[PDB]
Ligand binder design. Structure first.
Ligand SMILES: [K+]
Ligand SMILES: [K+]
Ligand SMILES: [K+]
Ligand SMILES: [Mg+2]
Ligand SMILES: [Mg+2]
Length: 136
RNA sequence: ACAU
DNA sequence: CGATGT
């Protein structure tokens, strides 16, 4: 504890896992939706969580914002730290789009710098992350 | 087991 | 119940 309210919170939403994947980022303090990705026909929860963080990094950098990012995903936080999304999802024609986006997100991480702290949202203490889709 |  | 991940 406690919550850094001056922050950006991100989350994935899906229909199936693997299944249709989307994500969004919100102002933690107000819940204002700041970005939303068009649904991607097949992906995994963790791919979406990863893309959401990287999109947040790009969004904040473009706006010269030093706010931290909250994610509830232990997995995605680690993938971003490593600059490598270690997904098990088969690479085939059906999954080409999500894998293109993941590949491109890794590529962005490997060609840009950032100081943005990427913080674990402590769901057990604070409840659902403010970017949550409310589907569970 | 923990995080989804 | 099923799945994705460390
Ligand atoms: K949800
Ligand atoms: K959660
Ligand atoms: K498991
Ligand atoms: Mg989440
Ligand atoms: Mg959620």
């Amino acid at each position: 504890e406690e919550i850094i309210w001056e922050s950006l919170s991100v989350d994935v939403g899906s229909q199936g896992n693997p299944g249709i994947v989307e994500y969004k980022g919100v102002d933690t303090k107000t819940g204002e939706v700041l970005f939303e990705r068009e649904p991607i026909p097949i992906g995994t929860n963790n791919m979406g969580e990863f893309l959401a963080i990287v999109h947040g990094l790009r969004y904040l950098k473009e706006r010269n914002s030093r706010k931290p990012i909250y994610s509830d995903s232990q997995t995605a936080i680690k993938w971003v730290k490593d600059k490598k999304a270690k997904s098990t999802l088969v690479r085939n024609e059906e999954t080409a789009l999500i894998w293109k986006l993941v590949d491109e997100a890794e590529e962005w991480l490997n060609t840009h710098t950032y100081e943005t702290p990427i913080l674990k949202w402590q769901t057990d203490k604070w409840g659902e992350i403010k970017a949550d889709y409310g589907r569970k």
